[PDB]
Amino acid sequence: SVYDAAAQLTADVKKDLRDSWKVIGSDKKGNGVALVTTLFADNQETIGYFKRLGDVSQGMANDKLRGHSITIMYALQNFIDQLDNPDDLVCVVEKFAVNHITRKISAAEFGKINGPIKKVLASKNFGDKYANAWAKLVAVVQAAL
Amino acid sequence: SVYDAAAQLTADVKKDLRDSWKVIGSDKKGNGVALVTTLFADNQETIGYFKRLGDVSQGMANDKLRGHSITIMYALQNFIDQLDNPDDLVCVVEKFAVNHITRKISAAEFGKINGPIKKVLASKNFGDKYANAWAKLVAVVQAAL
Ligand code: HEM
């Protein structure tokens, strides 16, 4: 299932993922917070899963939110690093899904992260071509949920 | 407290962490699996916390074990990347501790990783000076548990 989704990660898709990550991943705190705060702004209902973070309206200034935002970027770093080995990509993706499954986050719910990613990419001038590539990586994770 | 523990990361300690991570972090899969397999070998009592992983003695061949091993290395990468800013290091450590606190992992239990780290460093010709530097970073996490 996850292997089949990983199959959509073609040579060109992986190339665009790596090229865009070279920029997005160069500021994990800034872009990580941008992703998270954008998710909450565009889909307020997702805040229901983050009661532990406290006052999320504080954004970057909220230590817990900042800690979470920086940390999510290392999961993405992990994924990008394993792109050339399907066997490793699949095992770290299934490992990553464990806690999200326990939190009862469905594939559909997880997919809401696509909008924020598209917006963050656009802020760095990466068009639809790149957004589509990232949607395919997100789809690999969705296959594990 | 974690804030006092973070202040123990002096200039030279941070430098030694970076110099050793440059090598250790070069092969996250290899060193990650080595680190975890060594933990189970020197402290069989910790295996109980990893029932989900299955037969841990299979090592690299165990997909779940390999997935976990690679993933733990990105947490260390996160810590090293935050050494420049104490405020960020602290919020990232507290974030990291959440799930370990839920699993009932004590500071004493977590500290068992020092042995494996010392042995992996030694395998790459990094002596006691580096093992002690890493023990200080581990102490920051211990203060949060
Ligand atoms: C590209 C997207 C995402 C990445 C890379 C990501 C990454 C992570 C990472 C690494 C953690 C810490 C480890 C863990 O507890 O599993 C985490 C925690 C969590 N994630 Fe995900 N996640 C993403 C999207 C989502 C979405 C869309 C939701 C919910 C709608 C979600 C909800 C959570 C929650 C509630 C936690 C715990 C937060 C806390 O209490 O600190 N994640 N995620």
Ligand code: HEM
């Ligand atoms: C260098 C030290 C360590 C690092 C960097 C590390 C890193 C991580 C990371 C990143 C995760 C995945 C996210 C999460 O679920 O929290 C995790 C999971 C876990 N950790 Fe830690 N950890 C370390 C040591 C330990 C130790 C010493 C124990 C137990 C004695 C422990 C027990 C666990 C368990 C049981 C899981 C879940 C495994 C699974 O079911 O996949 N960790 N750890």
